[PDB]
From a paper:
As for 3E2, it mainly binds to an epitope on the opposite side of the 1C4 epitope; a similar binding mode is shown for nAbs S2X35, S2X259, VacW-209, COVA1-16, and CR3022. The binding epitope comprises a total of 13 residues (A372, S375, G404, D405, R408, N437, Q498, T500, N501, G502, V503, G504, Y505, and Y508), of which D405, R408, Y505, and Y508 form seven hydrogen bonds mainly with the light chain of 3E2. It seems that the larger the theoretical clash volume of the two antibodies, the more serious the structural variation, indicating the allosteric loop as being a critical region in the coordination of simultaneous binding. This structural information not only provides evidence for the existence of multiple potential cooperative mechanisms for synergetic neutralization capacity against SARS-CoV-2 but also demonstrates the rational design of antibody cocktails using Class I and Class IV nAb combinations.
The substantial and rapid development of mutations on the receptor-binding domain (RBD) of the viral spike protein has resulted in the diminished efficacy of currently available vaccines and immune therapies, as most were developed against the wild-type (WT) or early emergent variants. In this study, we generated two SARS-CoV-2 nAbs with potent and synergetic binding and neutralization efficiencies against various SARS-CoV-2 variants including early Omicron sublineages. Cryo-electron microscopy (cryo-EM) structures of the mono- and double-antibody-bound immune complexes reveal an antibody-binding-induced rearrangement of the RBD. However, here again, we show that, despite with theoretical collision, Class I and Class IV nAbs could simultaneously bind to the RBD and confer not only synergetic neutralization but also rearrangement of the bound RBD.
Numbering used by the authors:
A (entry chain L): 1 to 104
B (entry chain H): 1 to 121
C (entry chain G): 333 to 473, 489 to 526
D (entry chain D): 1 to 107
E (entry chain C): 1 to 119
The structure:
Amino acid sequence: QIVLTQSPAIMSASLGEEITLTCSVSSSVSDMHWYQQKSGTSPKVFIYSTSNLASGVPSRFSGSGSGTFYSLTISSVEAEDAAYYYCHQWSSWTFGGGTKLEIK
Amino acid sequence: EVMLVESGGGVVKPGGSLKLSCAASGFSFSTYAMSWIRQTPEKSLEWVAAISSGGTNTYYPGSVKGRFTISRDKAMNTLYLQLSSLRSEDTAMYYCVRHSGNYVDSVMDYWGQGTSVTVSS
Amino acid sequence: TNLCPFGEVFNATRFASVYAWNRKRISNCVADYSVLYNSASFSTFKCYGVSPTKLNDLCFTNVYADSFVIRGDEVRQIAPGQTGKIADYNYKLPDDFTGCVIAWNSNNLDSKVGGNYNYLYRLFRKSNLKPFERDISTEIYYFPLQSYGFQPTNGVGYQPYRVVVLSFELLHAPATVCG
Amino acid sequence: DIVLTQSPATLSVTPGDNVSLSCRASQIISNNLHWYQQKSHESPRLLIKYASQSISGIPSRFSGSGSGTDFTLSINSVETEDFGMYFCQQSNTWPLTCGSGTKLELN
Amino acid sequence: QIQLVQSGPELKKPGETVKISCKASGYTFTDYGLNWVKQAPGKGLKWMGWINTYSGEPTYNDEFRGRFAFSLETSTITAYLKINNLKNEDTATYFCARGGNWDWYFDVWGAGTTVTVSS
Ligand SMILES: *[C@@H]1O[C@H](CO)[C@@H](O[C@@H]2O[C@H](CO)[C@@H](O[C@@H]3O[C@H](CO)[C@@H](O)[C@H](O)[C@@H]3O)[C@H](O)[C@H]2NC(C)=O)[C@H](O)[C@H]1NC(C)=O
């Protein structure tokens, strides 16, 4: 079936840097969403259809990717963006392992 | 504005049953699809249920198959998820989400607060 | 007042696979599509040139009902203007396709826990394909006809979605199918 | 839906004869007809599948041929236990349905 | 051996509800679904609709729409038939047939319960 591997478990990025977040699949899927969850609140949506941005989110969260690779781009990292990040496609039954972005 | 609340999350010993209920308020209810996602204590999400717009199509994975019976209400604008025959691993925080398209295929925009069900003793 | 045999293509046990889709030419019918549209058991009812409430009261001469089985993740890409792994090797639509595409979820029939290894899709081709054309050529490219690995618990985008594709057509001929 | 008409309603054979049977349809199916045989007040069994092939455990005279919309079950030099009620049911469209039924009777 | 052991005969009055069992054995239960066949006396068979052997969802015929249910539990290999609101004309044998999920020929059958209804 489908597994979503995100490596590593936690990426390191001090402020002002531009880091990207990975999401890979075993069998090739058409698209991949992107969800964001802080520590203690319910998750929220950031990106659907691999490039479109959700409501009320600043214009640095614009990712891309196709086939078996889907990347999540953040241009200028801000210290508010310290949350657990999940990518999940329609054809999953199980989310990604989740990667938390920390500030060095 | 879109508003979702949850309830019913208590404690049941393994073997018992429990019913949840996600009340919706703030949109046309019988046009969008909803689904239930549980959150493991290791914070790894997976579906347990998914229901289409007209309440005709329900999908569950192989780990919770045969017992987790989701149900949609037409009148009072709520949404029930019924659980039974629990196991030791099914303790999780259960969210209530809403899709944007009339099927399950679209993305999940609005999320509930989530109750935590615990199987212990 | 005779009604069109839609039962022989909407109600069938074994839909053919995508690379060898069955085509059924329809003529001298009366086709009340309101029985189809108001069924509400279909998942994706997309129309591509006639409005789905307007399609009842206009005539045609010959409408082709193609039908096949694809993964749920690939039902969107049999629309015009999209090219993927399905829509250049197995079934490609023209850019002025006139008709409605009808699909639903079919995890009940075409699923076995060991696998359902008989629905086949053409993975590799020498070049791309011209629309409304098939090729049952099981010669070596590397065996190209790999099967879908289907299962009852595999994914809602990987359950088999039995899709029938209407294709309306009006030529220089007396139109019959009005309703 | 299809309805399946068997003809005639009854037979009258002597043991050792080569007599065939008839099952005709109202739609045209791609050889998706099977053939069942039921004796008195018990369960029927399968004889042949897809109107031309055959499975194990079946006597050799029980073979059928022909596709399209008219199908015939052929048995030659019958036995003194092959008599009873014989059934044909199709498997193409829905719902599945069986024939009305014939009675194989031994003179 | 591969067989579908059934229940015994019944005798009800109009207004009751029957539960006919059909237990499978030998073959693995997930590869092949089950069926139900109603043989009215001196009549032809009728296909009462099948049941998906894994998930448990039925699919009735267009004639047995109400007053029927195809229950199933898979802890023990056992499938049920439930008949609501028994009338005067439902007296028949009820086989259960192991029709496949890719072929739909009833290969291996059961015995059948000759249910009867009377005032
Ligand atoms: C493909 O087959 C399905 C059955 O598996 C057809 O659905 C059934 O269609 C019939 C008529 O086409 C419906 O019968 C009608 O029911 C109403 C009550 O709702 C009754 O008052 C009428 O007199 C008539 O008998 C039946 O309800 C319906 N069943 C379901 C579950 O939808 C389907 O129409 C077929 N597709 C075609 C013909 O395109």
